[PDB]
Design a binder for these strands. Structure first.
Lengths: 182, 182
DNA sequence: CAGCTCTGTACGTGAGCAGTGGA
DNA sequence: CCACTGCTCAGTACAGAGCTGT
């Protein structure tokens, strides 16, 4: 099982379906170096240098970023999880975000949100795009922001430098949200 | 983590390097694909239906085949098993084969045998070929038959069918030795 | 320098997969 | 909404750098 990385006062929280064999194994979030998470982060000026999964523990204090997932059971892939298993999941995730209250809940890939929505919000988001969504985290001021899966096991973009747009945008959205309190 | 499947009176005993993330995760030998292992067996004629990692414990009593690995820690794989480890692995592995004494000890993939031999027999082998090897298992009538990895991490045997050859040999070598044996 | 060894890296394929847009 | 696109991830041979003796 893979450790959450959560503190108070976060800008961002990256949010997987649940940890995979590799990540269970290394004990850190997003080991590849195939997978694009860590490059995206560097690419987008979200991190000033280029880091890797070994540095995950530093992300809250130094970049105000943290990690977690709907499910905590570790499997090979989402296709191994029950519907049931996801319910108790986002139930427990809502409860976390109500506790930690970051500015923005960022979802890895349409897939995971698409669930959360027709679960937490009782609504099949039809025709979904990436980035800021209309609903806040229930009982919070936390935004949901949907991000193309960091997994290169994907159609596009996959390729770390085309998901950078969404990182830049996220980054700016963060930036916007700190000016509000001027 | 991954349990040996071993009896007495086995013809063949596949010996993998160690148990990777899938296999670890599912307590069963050669899950993949890509492992061409369950494939080859069938299309090599060594089984008469194509089966998989969950018939693994039936391979003794039904086809007199058994399983085990040189080293036993779970890793990704593979290029990350220590220098040491492997040596000590081989001390245990020998003991088992003197315990159980299968007609043959198939090594799945070079570098294990490559290394086993380097350890057990005192020989760094020139230009290893796949197939039967000079030496018996010390103090047993058990043969050593090298075989190219069934991992698909391996470019120079692109497809499963680039490997069945050794399985058809393997059959034969067993088939010869089986009588003898009137 | 062949031969010896000591790392380093560059390699095919399919299966699984996220996403998009095709029946 | 099955299919279709790019791209991950699951040991081993040769390159070359750096010693030995013709």
């Amino acid at each position: 099982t893979l450790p959450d990385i959560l503190t108070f006062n976060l800008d961002i929280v990256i949010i997987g379906i649940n940890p995979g064999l590799m990540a269970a194994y290394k004990g850190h979030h997003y080991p590849g170096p195939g997978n694009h998470f860590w490059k995206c982060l560097f690419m987008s000026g979200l991190s000033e240098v280029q880091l890797n999964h070994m540095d995950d523990h530093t992300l809250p204090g130094k970049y105000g970023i943290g990690f977690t997932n709907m499910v905590e059971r570790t499997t090979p892939g989402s296709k191994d999880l029950s519907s049931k298993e996801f319910r108790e999941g986002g139930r427990i995730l809502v409860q976390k975000l109500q506790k930690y209250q970051p500015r923005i809940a960022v979802f890895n890939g349409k897939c995971i949100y698409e669930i959360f929505s027709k679960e937490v919000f009782g609504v099949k988001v039809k025709n979904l795009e990436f980035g800021l969504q209309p609903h806040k985290i229930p009982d919070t001021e936390t935004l949901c922001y949907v991000m193309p899966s960091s997994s290169a096991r994907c159609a596009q973009f996959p390729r770390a430098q085309d998901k950078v747009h969404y990182y830049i945008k996220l980054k700016d959205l963060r930036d916007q949200l700190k000016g509000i309190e001027r």
